[model samples]
Every structure is written in structure tokens, then in C-alpha cells.
Target: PADRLKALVDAAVQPVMKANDIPGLAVAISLKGEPHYFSYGLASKEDGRRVTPETLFEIGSVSKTFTATLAGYALAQDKMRLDDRASQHWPALQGSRFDGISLLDLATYTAGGLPLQFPDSVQKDQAQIRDYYRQWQPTYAPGSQRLYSNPSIGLFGYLAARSLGQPFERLMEQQVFPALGLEQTHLDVPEAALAQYAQGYGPGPLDAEGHGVKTSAADLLRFVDANLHPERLDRPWAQALDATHRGYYKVGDMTQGLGWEAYDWPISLKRLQAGNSTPMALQPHRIARLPAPQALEGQRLLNKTGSTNGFGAYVAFVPGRDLGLVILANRNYPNAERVKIAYAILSGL
Candidate 1:
């Protein structure tokens, strides 16, 4: 079965790498809760280091999913409420437009018209970041439109940390990650483990929402396994994980969960690809808010795609099928192709 799985993964991965000029890749698959990993190419072209299942790759926006889980945990502990106004945590935002923006809106990217990235003026400048939110105006009423934004979700996580009285990075590194039994995942990779970090082939800077985490295929697969079997986790964590899967709104054919996007299963590749297409990321889509968050039931395909300037990653799993897949590459390739490759591999399985 391992060979058969490798054959399927190779058939999908090899050509993609050849076409995209990727230096390295890691793929992980889970059937029920059992995981298998297959890796290829060089982790570092200069060092001639080949990728192993443990090689770390930047997960980009996929980090948002983890951020969402942090919020979920905060909710479980009652440190924050979804309906809490952003101003409640960051008092500086007290009298700003954020007064009307709920934590849910930020987490879902439904907080009016926050841009995909913060203005360059605010990058790492705490004063400017505060000023940007202070001087901000709404383009659409909160919860009316889906505008994928780093600043929006970035603030969501930051507020979660404020509520919990911990720095976001420390909280994630010391608590959230360890809580999930993820030993090889990090918001910042330790210096000594630098050699195992893959060399991504692109020129781009990372951001909090678009990037900030590095993980190996093995650890990521373990995270997916937790989703597949939340009962194995503690009651509060299981509750938090379940909340992340609840459908908050519908955009086109896709149902938006807290972090992951879902599609009714028995889905077509074309449909899945279109949902993950460029327009979905770069443009706002009017949303149909669910009367209440829809509980995950029946066959559903849940996924999220992440990319930095050089690295690309996609995670998808069908709970009904007890199947999940993770694809990570050191080259930034089109998301449609990542979705296609994942669809192909998961289909064959």
C-alpha cells in the first residue's frame, strides 16, 4: 500500500515539479488516522540536501488556519467572544470603525473592505499599524462581503492574544502547537534546525497573514489526523476544532468555515479549482451568511491553500471519506495546479 500510494503521489508530483522548476516537495496523506509521507528533490539546491518527510517548508497563508484554531481555543476558554468588538481588546481602536467590526468578521475576512495586505506604511511600525486602523473607513458593512485580507485576520489573531494576555508568537509556539502534539511546527524555526529548512525559490517577503509558519509533512499530517478524529483530543480542544469546521457563510459553491473552505463532496475538479482560483483570493465575493453556522455533516471536502513568494502549499481532506492530503513545494506555483494535483491524488486514493 505504501508503494501504491507512492506511485500515485509520484505520478502527480513529479511532472508538476518538472514543469514548475521546484527544488523540493513533501506530500502527506492520511487514511482514517494513519499517515504516509513521500518526499522528493533537494531541500537545498546549494547544499545538495535532499528533501525528507521531515523537511520544513513555509506554509504561508495556511498559517491562518492555525491562527483560527487559536481563536477557537480562546473561545473555548472564554477569553474572548466571537461577537466581541475589536476595540474591546485593543483599546487604541476604541473609537475607530473597529467598534462595529466583530472578531468573527475579522476571522472570516468579512470585516468590510480591509485590503489583502496592510499598507506598506504600517509594516512592522506599531504606531503606523495603529494609525492605519484608527484612520480606516469601511468600504462595505461588516459581514456583507468577503475580502480576503491579511490585516483583517492578522488583527484577529492579535486580539486573541490580547484576550489571553500572551504575545501571539509565544502563545502559538508554547501552547497552541504543543497542545496539538505538533513538535515540528513553528512560528519561527529554531536556528539549530536551519539545515532542514528547505530553500524556497522565489523573491518575496513574508507577512503575518500570508506567512509565518514552517512545518514538516509529518507534523502537518498529524494535525490533519486530529481534525479527522477530534474525539482523541481533550474536550475543549475538540470543541474548538469542531467550531472551526462549522460553515459561516457561502461564497459561490464554496462554504466558508473559520479558516478552512468547504465544498459539498463528490465535487468536480473544475468546481474545486474555480473556488480556489485567483479571483477568489484577490476579489471580494458577496456572501450569503448562514442563518447559523452549519455543522459539518455528510460528505464534505474541506481545504485551504497557502503560498509565499517561493513556497506553495495546499491542504484538503474529506471527513466522510476519512481522507486528507497535504502538498508542499519550495516553488510558488499556481493554486489551481495545487488543487488539481491534490484532487488527482485524493481521487485515486
Candidate 2:
């Protein structure tokens, strides 16, 4: 008989899909080095193209994981060092607070207080990014808190590429993608795939809607496969994935590994109380301590979430368990809920 656990997950996911209003979604799971795939909903809302294992979707900030992987590749080649200061890379930001921050800190979002998004001024141009770092001051000391930042990671990717004497896009296209055999996994959808590309949507102006950032479920499965079988990856990509698995910073019940987040589930709740009577009625109250801060141990759970105006994606793997999952959707879906569903399915297997 089919595993009862698998049947449970199949039933559990239906409500999740209905509640989320997702137009179309794809899920891929791997356990003990084997893969299983499933899909639901429509890929295109306009023409109603059904989502399939081959459909591609934008995977938002999860792209940061790729950026981090590139940094790892550079590290392996001795082209860069995690401890190298940001100033050592860009140089223009030398005298600023970012001067002392290391590339490692930047990748893990522990740099002396970088904001989540570049200030409006910095987004105007690439040069402004350096200038912004030069003028900005840290609100918290370096390594004091975990603050996720896109511009911080974007800058890291840019600097890593610059240090290697290559453009970031080229690094992925010529090196990372080919190494993993992910010909379709790219920042820009190639002209040949445009016909099959699904329109992406986010809350924005009409012109901004449906921009294509196509990547197939198969491409992501290849990524998971690389993590599982690093030796299969080109030397550079393998080294990069290894570096990405190293833990660098702590974020509550999770640790921010090189490019992924590590979570310890069943997060702690502080307190629970019931009853309104102060003097007459009996009342029950309890205080629940938050989950103890524990080092992520055994079977490291690595995950990254990505989103674009119209697309949302998630990638997660457990090295010890030999399991990995990738989820991609064309519409703007809640990443947490998506991850929850993926995790539920993975736990069953």
C-alpha cells in the first residue's frame, strides 16, 4: 500500500491551496536521493495554461541563495575571503561604517545594521549604492542583530562579481547554471522560452504586471540534486554550495547559514491565560517559555525564500535526511504558507 503519510499530505495540501487563492503552483520533493513531483492550479490566468512540472516561475529573494552560492565559489578559488571587508571590495565605501563590515556579515544580514531595502536615494543607480554605504551609519553594532536586506545582498553579489572580474549575470549563466545543468534558470528569460513563459503578477501598475522571470520546476529540482550530489556539480558550484551551508549568524530560533536560513520548529510561546474573574471565578493561566536558543544540530535544514512582484518561490533541503523541496508559483502568494505546505509534504515522506 502507498504510505499513509503520503496520503495524509495529499489531503492536507488541498485546503492550503484553496485558502491561498493561488492561480497555479508546482512542488517537487526529494527523499533519500529520489524525486517526486506534483502540480496544481493554472500557470497563466489569462489563457488558463495549467501548471505542470515543466512550468517555470520567478523565485524572488530566493535568488539570494544563488548569489550566496557564487560568493562561495569565489571563496573556494581564493578569489575572495569571507572575512574580507566590504571596503576591500568596492573601496569607494572605505571611510564609512561599511568599511569594517566583512562580506560574511553582509551575506548573513549581520553587517553593522544595514537596512532591509536600500534607501530611496540608493535605488536610483548602481553608483549610489557605494555612496549610500559610505554615508549610512549602523544603528546596531555588527553581529548584534539579524536584519535581512535585499540591497545588502544585491551589493554583495555585485561586489563578489566585480572582485572576480565578471558580471553577476555572466557568473550564473556561464558558470553556475551550466554546472548545474539549469539552462533555463536565469535572471532573464531567454527569447526562445518567451513563448512558454507565464505572465507574473504583483500589486503594481499595469506596466509592472506580468513581467516574466521564467524557470521550470525541473531546473530547481536540479538545484536540489546538486545539493544532494555536490560531486556531480562542477568543482566551483560544489564548493559554493558547501560554503553556503556554513552557519554564520543567529536569528531567533533560526540561524542564518551562508545563504539559507536554518529553523528549529515549534517556536516557543511566552504565555497563555484564560478566565475574566479577578476575585470570584477560578482561572487557569500558564506561561510558556520560548524555545531555548539551541545551536542548529543534526540534519541541517537549509532554506531560502524568493519573491518578485508577481512570483513567489521557496527552496529547502535537509542534508542529513537527504531531502529537498522546491515550490514555485506565478501569482503573489504568501511564502510562509507555501513553505508550510512544502514542509508538510516533505515530513510525510
For each candidate, the alpha-carbon lDDT, in order, equals: 0.87, 0.66
Model 1 Cα lDDT, one tens digit per residue, 1-349: 7688888888988888888888898999998667788888998999899988899999998888888888888999999999999999999999899999999999999999999988665757667778888999889899999999988888898899889998888888888888899999987789988988999898112255347889998888888888787879998888778878889899988998878899998889999999999999999999998888897645999899998778999998888888989898899999988987898798888
Writing each residue's lDDT as its tens digit, candidate 2 over 1-349 gives 2467457556656677788777787877776777777777788889988888788687766677777777888888898897888888776877888777878767766675566566655554556655777787877666555556665676678778878888777777888777678777767777877666766766111101112134788788878778767777767777888777666544344566666677543222210001101210111112122244233335556676667777778787777677788888776676557666766665565
Residue 116 error for model 2, in Å?
Answer: 1.4
After superposing candidate 2 on the true structure, give the runs of residues whose Cα lies further than 4 Å from its correct spot.
Answer: 1-9, 203-214, 264-298
Highest-TM-score candidate: 1
Clashing pairs in 1: none
Q: Poorest 10 consecutive residues of model 1 by lDDT?
A: 203-212
Q: Tell me, by lDDT, which candidate is best.
A: 1
